[PDB]
């Protein structure tokens, strides 16, 4: 849908911005405190209790 400049510059640049950050959690593997084991979970748990009428809240109490 969105056409940008040449693919060559798009790739080289991609790696540029990815390298300047690819030394911790973005690409590299280090420090599991920020975000390493949770890239993009589905966010869901068994109905526990008062926490919204979405789909998780015990049963009635």
């Amino acid at each position: 849908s969105s056409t940008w400049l040449s693919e060559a510059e798009m790739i080289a640049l991609a790696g540029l911005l990815q390298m300047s950050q690819g030394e911790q959690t973005p690409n590299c593997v280090a420090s599991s405190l920020p975000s390493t084991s949770c890239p993009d979970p589905v966010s869901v748990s068994e109905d526990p209790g008062p926490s919204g009428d979405q789909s998780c809240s015990g049963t009635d109490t």
Partner: protein, 71 residues
């Protein structure tokens, strides 16, 4: 919010401007990035090669290291 890609592109144009009479350094720069983007060299290789790829203009280099993580 920290690095920003738009700023990087602006830097790309800046390089193409200065070395407008020498599109060689440009092609070599992006080419290198692709080699690292695919499978060939590592981070230290890109930083070193590029540093020597711009031998003569400490300006672009000075602003280039800004992108990479300081410390």
């Amino acid at each position: 919010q920290r690095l920003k890609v738009e700023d990087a592109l602006s830097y790309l144009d800046q390089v193409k401007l200065q070395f407008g009479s020498q599109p060689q350094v440009y092609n070599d720069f992006l080419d290198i990035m692709k080699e690292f983007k695919s499978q060939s060299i590592d981070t230290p290789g890109v930083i070193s090669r590029v540093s020597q790829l711009f031998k003569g203009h400490p300006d672009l280099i000075m602003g280039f290291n800004t992108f990479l993580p300081p410390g």
